[PDB]
């Protein structure tokens, strides 16, 4: 059991394993497996902030905090967005632009 990390899965279960046996298997255990319920009225199913910044290579616990950090602002102001700008250079701006409104 849990103590030896050896034993058998309580049923019902689903078990998925890569055939190369290189990775930990994935398990699903539920009280009841899914059941197609035809009596539930349509359209109901018959079966009825933290993040990672790819720029800083850094986990963060709150987005707004991270966006204002020194390392993120440094990336944001860098030349790393040239790949975006090179696509924008091919697009045509065809909207009217207004002067800023002043009293």
């Amino acid at each position: 059991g849990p103590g030896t990390r050896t034993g058998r899965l309580k049923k019902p279960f689903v078990k998925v394993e890569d055939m190369s046996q290189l990775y930990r298997p994935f398990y699903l255990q539920l009280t009841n497996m899914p059941f197609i319920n035809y009596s539930i009225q349509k359209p109901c199913s018959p079966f009825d902030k933290k993040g990672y910044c790819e720029c800083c290579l850094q986990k963060y616990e709150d987005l707004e905090t991270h966006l204002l950090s020194e390392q993120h602002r440094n990336f944001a102001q860098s030349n790393q967005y040239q790949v975006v700008d090179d696509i924008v250079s091919k697009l045509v701006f065809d909207f009217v632009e207004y002067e800023k409104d002043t009293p």
Partner: protein, 340 residues
């Protein structure tokens, strides 16, 4: 109030927007983006409604540009959304697209006619045929990413934020986006300290679990354009059965168990062998006849005359084997679409 502040922050983040757009409302709030409805004036045309997609500023520039490049290169034709312009200030990128007013899928189901189902699926396959021709795997096909305007009979596949390229993709930027031991638990209900101690298998992020193909749910390393055709089949299954969401699951293996209750546990297990996955399911469930399944779920009376060709196409879209699963180009030639 909450939307009013979001709009104010967007104007602050990209100040150029204040002199071009009247931002009216927030129409999308995802984990990795916010989409706004705005009004703009065209220099040599009428006033236009515009969708502004603000990408989360933690996205890498290459991922931002790859999404934009799908829209610029593959978009604008064959029911694939295009792009008018893109505004950037530092890490804030806003994609400006023509706004397509559209129906919610629950409203589609509420007034659905059979010919509307045919037209919707036909136009979805036109968009998938085009993006697959460019070597784009969308990875997030579902109704909220396929806009339908019933009055105009206009359609647009949107949202390439999770797209990946095929090996020979024509979207250049998509190219740029201890030891494990065997044990005797293989193909049994056993666990042991050997298999439990292996590292986790990883795969690219996909969309909503209820639209993921079995090879996505089981973390197959080779995921092809066929995964989008499975997702299209899930949309078709919702249209024919009247049930949405059809698969209601927040995790991959629950979705897989639901799929096995529809397509059969033994059938799913046999198909998974071909893409290198061993599946064991302690409770065997039979494959369902698709006509009977959809007719019983939708109600009787009156839609009892759906042709065999509809359920035959649904069977090919929901092929558990991703190699034999129908392609978008083949789907357009299917007898279901005779005369269209």
């Amino acid at each position: 109030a909450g939307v009013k502040k979001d709009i104010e922050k967007l104007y602050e983040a990209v100040p150029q927007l204040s002199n071009v757009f009247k931002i009216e409302d927030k129409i999308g709030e995802g984990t990795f983006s916010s989409v706004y409805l705005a009004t703009a004036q065209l220099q040599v045309g009428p006033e236009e409604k515009i969708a502004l997609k603000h990408l989360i500023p933690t996205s890498h520039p290459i991922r931002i540009a790859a999404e934009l490049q799908c829209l610029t290169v593959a978009g604008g034709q064959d029911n694939v959304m295009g792009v008018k312009y893109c505004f950037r200030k530092n890490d804030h990128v806003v994609i400006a697209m023509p706004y397509l007013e559209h129906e919610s899928f629950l409203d589609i189901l509420n007034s659905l006619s059979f010919q509307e189902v045919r037209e919707y699926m036909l136009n979805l396959f036109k968009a998938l045929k085009r993006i697959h021709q460019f070597g784009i795997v969308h990875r997030d096909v579902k109704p909220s990413n396929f806009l339908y305007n019933r009055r105009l009979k206009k359609y647009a596949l949107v949202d390439f934020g999770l797209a990946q390229g095929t090996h020979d993709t024509k979207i250049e930027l998509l190219k740029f986006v201890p030891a494990s031991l065997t044990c005797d638990c293989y193909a049994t209900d056993k666990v042991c300290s050997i298999c439990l101690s292996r590292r986790q298998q990883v795969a690219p992020r996909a969309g909503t679990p209820g639209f993921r193909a079995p090879e996505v749910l089981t973390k197959c390393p080779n995921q092809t354009t066929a995964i989008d055709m499975w997702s299209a089949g899930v949309i078709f299954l919702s249209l024919l059965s009247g049930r949405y969401p059809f698969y209601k699951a927040s995790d991959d293996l629950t979705a897989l168990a639901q799929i096995m209750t529809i397509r059969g546990s033994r059938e799913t297990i046999q198909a998974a062998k071909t893409f290198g996955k061993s599946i064991l399911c302690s409770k065997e469930v039979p494959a369902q006849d698709l006509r009977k399944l959809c007719e019983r779920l939708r109600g009787a009376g009156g839609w009892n005359e759906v042709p065999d060709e509809a359920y035959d196409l649904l069977d090919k879209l929901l092929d558990l084997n991703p190699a034999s699963r129908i392609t978008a180009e083949e789907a357009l030639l299917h007898p279901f679409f005779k005369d269209m």
